[PDB]
Protein: Spike glycoprotein
Organism: Severe acute respiratory syndrome coronavirus 2
Amino acid sequence: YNYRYRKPFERDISTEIYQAGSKPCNGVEGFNCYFPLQSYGF
Amino acid sequence: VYAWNRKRISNCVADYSVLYNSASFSTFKCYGVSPTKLNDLCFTNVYAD
């Protein structure tokens, strides 16, 4: 859980749930409503 | 489910963007690109089952 992934030399420290398609997710999770950051299974 | 086969579309137009809201995908998911963003594309056999 310590190690995770999602312009040049940017560092976007935000973690807003993706409005990943046709839906105004805005805190809701589901189809087309995906949390952007994932752990590497190390 | 244990007896299906690789049917497909051929020689036709397509309109894949509708799968982003239509009841035919009321639950849905992908390995490939977003349904309307990829919706203009094509490949040599439209394999579907």
In short: The two ends of chain A are 8 Å apart (CA to CA). Chain A touches chain B at residues 21-22, 31-32 (CB under 8 Å). The beta strands of chain A are 4-5, 38-39. Chain A has no helices and two strands.
